[PDB]
Design a protein around this nucleic acid. Sequence first.
DNA 1: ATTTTGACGCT
Length: 430
Amino acid sequence: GPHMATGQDRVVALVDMDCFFVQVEQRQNPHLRNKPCAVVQYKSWKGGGIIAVSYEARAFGVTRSMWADDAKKLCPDLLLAQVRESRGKANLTKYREASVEVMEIMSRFAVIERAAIDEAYVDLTSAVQERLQKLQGQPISADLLPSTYIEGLPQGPTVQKEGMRKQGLFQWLDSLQIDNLTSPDLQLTVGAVIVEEMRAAIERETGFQCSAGISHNKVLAKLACGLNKPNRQTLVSHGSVPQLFSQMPIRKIRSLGGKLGASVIEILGIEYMGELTQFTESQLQSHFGEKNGSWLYAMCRGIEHDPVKPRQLPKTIGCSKNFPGKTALATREQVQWWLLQLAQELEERLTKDRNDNDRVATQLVVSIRVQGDKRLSSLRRCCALTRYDAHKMSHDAFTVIKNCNTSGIQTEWSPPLTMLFLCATKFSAS
DNA sequence: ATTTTGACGCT
Ligand SMILES: [Ca+2]
Ligand SMILES: [Mg+2]
């Protein structure tokens, strides 16, 4: 009752660039705009692997992970942009720099947590408080929310999508009590106004469109963002959670898409997030551990406390290459040459990072995979990173991995290497 | 033969 926490203390947004790599290429090449198109890395093997798909192309069934030749079977007019290749490998610099464009705009509005190259969480609590003080009890016009969906509405006693959107928004705004400045629903609504403004600024200043979710925590914000894509934003209120979760497969909630969510489903014999409310917190901890159990018990009620962390820059700078099937590295000189390629890209990115961000990496992590192992990484070893020098870094990585070679022969490498990975970590201010 | 990333938890 009066002491039951409701997880309504914050306003949190999750902003997600729509088909991001595709938009970067479409901004650069107008011929690709408003067309079925995809971004592909490499071209030799089956036309290349698709890593991003425009919504026009998704309408044909084109997906990420698809080979471009197969996507062309589904969508013969599919247009393709290739990821740059440098030093023998795919190079993602253009997309990292475009990401920085967007993150810097978002940071003008609020503290952001970089969640991935194309998405950030936004802590809007303070900004909402200030905006509420500016408004002076003035009601919020639907005109301030031209691309917002209110999940769960309309309901109760038009056949077009925008008409439904407006009907639900009208019902929401008509019910709102704008005089109570501590109303969580009002606070979410002002948050959505700010996010409309943020998304307008991003589009104006970069050309990039995005979707967003607005709710009271990160997990609900993330889930809300996916409900109406592309180029739209969705408000998920605390009150919407019971109905939303009543048919929501558990795997849709962030962190439950893998083995843990599968174990929740199997051990508990349930399918939907709302079905979790019928277990005690101790029951959930008994099956899934103290932390996961407490998290699940609160999350299925719409409550989560993970903070938006003030971190706009990545914590690691890495580069890796797979060597599948017959291309697996079988000679020492091969391994060394590719370590050098990876190390040279790493040095370039590290020097740029040091100049832009006043920090230096202090640890070099080296990871390899050996042929036959199902795990993504077979072995990981670290060494000191004391100089931004590609030859030193490649030599050191070889030093820490060279004992993995089972071969009795000197120049040969066995078992062959199917993956190399260099990662700079443990940054310190400089 | 998806590939190339990135953050975080466990022990
Ligand atoms: Ca995205
Ligand atoms: Mg994303």
